[PDB]
Amino acid sequence: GEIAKALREIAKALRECAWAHREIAKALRG
Amino acid sequence: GEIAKALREIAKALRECAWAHREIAKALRG
Amino acid sequence: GEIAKALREIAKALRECAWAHREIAKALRG
Amino acid sequence: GEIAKALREIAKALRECAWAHREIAKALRG
Amino acid sequence: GEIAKALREIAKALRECAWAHREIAKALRG
Amino acid sequence: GEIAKALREIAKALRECAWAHREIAKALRG
Amino acid sequence: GEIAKALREIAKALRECAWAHREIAKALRG
């Protein structure tokens, strides 16, 4: 369904956010 | 549908958020 | 519909968040 | 409806988050 | 309804996030 | 219901995020 | 259901976000 697909799109964007936050943690280390 | 379209706009905004967090990581590295 | 409108409000608020995160990146570089 | 009202509460909370992120940007500038 | 109640929990959690982001701004100023 | 339970898991995850942001505010203080 | 499954993906992505924010707090402390 279109609604399920859009919700999966939201999840994908949030996994993208998480990746970026992990990069921030690494940047602060260095 | 209007609900699906709005959910897709939520995902798009979160992709913007992810892009900015990646820029934050870059600013911290540099 | 009221549900669709509310979901669009959520998306707009997240677009505000993204703008603010971009400002944080700009502040860190500057 | 209760669902629409709850979704608007989510948007309002996210607008609060954006406000705080804007404050973080200003704090970093100074 | 259970769905509305859960959405309200989501909004409340985001209000917690906003409070914490405000504390982050305050810590940066101080 | 499965949908309500999933929404409550989203809320719980966001409360975890808030806890982490509170730790960030503390870390900046120290 | 597909909608419930997608909402659970959203929750899991937020749990990834929370882990990363904790790592950010740890990096700032150290």
Among candidate residues F27, E18, D25, the one with its CA nearest the CA of residue G24: F27
* Chain A residues with beta carbon closer than 8 angstroms to that of G27: 25-26, 28-29
For chain E, say whether D6 makes contact (Cβ under 8 Å): yes
**Residue type at G25 in one-letter notation:** A
The structure tokens listed for D26 are: 């200003």
Q: How many CA atoms lie within 13 A of C4 on its CB side?
A: 8
**Residue type at B20 in one-letter notation:** A
Closest chain G residue to the Cα of F8, Cα to Cα: G11
Burial class (CB in 10 A: 0-12, 13-18, 19+), G30: exposed
Q: How far is CA G26 from the centre of its chain?
A: 16
Among partner residues E1, E5, E25, which is closest to D23 by beta-carbon distance? E25
**What is the SS3 assignment for F30?**
coil
| Residue D29 contacts residue C28 (beta carbons within 8 Å) | no
**What is the SS3 assignment for A3?**
helix
List, as one string, the DSSP characters of F4-20: HHHHHHHHHHHHHHHHH
What is the domain partition of chain C in residue ranges? 1-30
* Chain E residues with beta carbon closer than 8 angstroms to that of D30: 29
| Residue C24 contacts residue D28 (beta carbons within 8 Å) | yes
* CB burial string B7-26: b at 16+ within 10 A, e below: bbbbbbbbbbbbbbbbbbbb
| Residue D16 contacts residue E15 (beta carbons within 8 Å) | yes
| Secondary structure letter of residue E1 according to DSSP | -
How was this entry determined?
A: X-ray
How far apart CA E23 and CA F16 sit, in angstroms, is 16
| Residue G20 contacts residue A18 (beta carbons within 8 Å) | yes
Among candidate residues D1, F10, A4, D4, the one with its CA nearest the CA of residue C6: D4
How far apart CA G14 and CA B7 sit, in angstroms, is 17
Residues in chain B: 30
For chain A, say whether G4 makes contact (Cβ under 8 Å): no
Closest chain A residue to the Cα of G3, Cα to Cα: A4
| Secondary structure letter of residue C1 according to DSSP | -
Q: How many CA atoms lie within 13 A of G15 on its CB side?
A: 11
The structure tokens listed for D17 are: 């988050």
Element (H or E) spanning C23, and its range?
helix C2-29
How far apart CA E25 and CA C5 sit, in angstroms, is 31
Element (H or E) spanning E30, and its range?
none
Q: How far is CA D29 from the centre of its chain?
A: 21
Phi, psi values for residue B22, rounded to 5°: -65, -35
How far apart CA F23 and CA A21 sit, in angstroms, is 15
How far apart CA A11 and CA G10 sit, in angstroms, is 4
